[PDB]
Structure formats: structure tokens, C-alpha cells
Design a protein around this ligand. Structure first.
Ligand code: FES
Ligand code: FES
Lengths: 110, 110
């Protein structure tokens, strides 16, 4: 009673993103930042929804920071502060065979 | 004894790029990073020559850094280290009427 289409990609070894760090990967047309912090491995779009620069993980401040107009986001992409209109799109992410597997789903009813 | 074609664009107010900072601008088909550091206002292509992520200025480290795979460049776009094949193409930049004017030339001899 629902159709959904999932894109799925093993982007790199789990050892790429050890604790306290974040790394940017290509996901087809988007760029995703995968973050490993506080026991939690998350994945969100790395492109600011304001005007489209790349973000990075700031471990000391426990935040994602955008270098262009000062946007600050949570590890999960939620808005902390800045001019950005939207949160960064949330991905799913898992470790499989020692690999970081990122995925996103788009739904549709039958 | 030389003819050249110059693209020129007043990209924003000079107040946009104070000392110790760098800013990204659309320059027709390229994107340029203008950096103000050490009394020197420079402008180079913002597109990393490895795989094309947008770069940013790192004032603390005195370098242009690409967030994807670690490319480092000097303020003038020269390669410091990383997987990139090429330096960032250099633009010329000056202040007029409190505005940042970026320009680049393509040659023709006669
Ligand atoms: S493009 Fe990220 S703050 Fe504007
Ligand atoms: S895109 Fe800059 S290091 Fe690869």
C-alpha cells in the first residue's frame, strides 16, 4: 500500500569517520556530510539551503558550520541560527561490511 | 603590441571582505574567492581543481582549503598540498567606489 524508491550507496570505510569527526561525500547529485559524534553516526546534506556552499563539522562547538553566511546547524541538520530558510535534508546511514552506507527514500501510495 | 579581452564585474562592496576573511562570488561562469589578508586583496577561482568542490578561506592556517579531500592552496591559488592537479586560476581585483572589481584577461597578440 506504499511504493518508495531508495537510493543507497556505500560511500567509504567506516574507519573514514571516527569519533569527533565529519566527512563530505558525493551522493549522486548532492553532497552529504557524515558525522560521528557522541556515539551517533548521522548523515545530512552538506550544501547550505540558503545559497549553496559546503559545510563542515565543528567538533569543539558540537555543530555543523557553513563558512559563507554563518549558518549553524545541528549534527542532524536542524537550524541553530543564521539566514538559512531550511534544515539540511536528513539521510539514513548505517555500517555494513565495515562500510558507511548512506540512503534516502521517496514515498508514494498505491 | 598586445590586445586582450577582459571580463570585469563589480562583485560587491569592499566592506564585504574585511581583513582576515574571504568571500565567494559568482563571476559569470566561474566562482571566485576574494581574500583579504596581510594587506593583500587577492582573487582566484573558488572551484577546487581536483573534483570541483567549493573552497573556503582558512584565516587561522593562512590557506585556501577544500573541504572534500584536503586540497590546500595559498592565498594566490598556488598548490600547497593535496590531490589537486592544478593551481586555482588567478584573477585580478581592485577597489573602486568602495566596490570590489574582479577581472580576468584572455590574450591576442598583434
Ligand atoms: S550559503 Fe550557507 S549561509 Fe548562505
Ligand atoms: S574536490 Fe578539492 S580536494 Fe577533491
Amino acid at each position: 500500500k506504499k511504493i518508495k524508491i531508495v537510493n543507497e550507496l556505500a560511500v567509504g570505510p567506516a574507519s573514514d569517520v571516527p569519533n569527533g569527526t565529519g566527512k563530505i561525500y558525493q551522493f549522486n547529485d548532492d553532497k552529504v556530510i557524515v558525522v560521528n559524534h557522541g556515539g551517533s553516526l548521522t548523515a545530512v546534506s552538506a550544501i547550505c539551503t540558503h545559497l549553496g556552499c559546503l559545510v563542515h563539522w565543528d567538533e569543539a562547538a558540537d555543530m555543523i558550520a557553513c563558512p559563507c553566511h554563518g549558518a549553524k546547524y545541528t549534527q542532524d541538520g536542524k537550524i541553530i541560527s543564521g539566514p538559512q530558510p531550511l534544515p539540511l535534508k536528513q539521510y539514513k546511514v548505517k555500517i555494513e561490511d565495515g562500510k558507511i552506507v548512506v540512503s534516502i527514500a521517496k514515498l508514494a501510495a498505491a
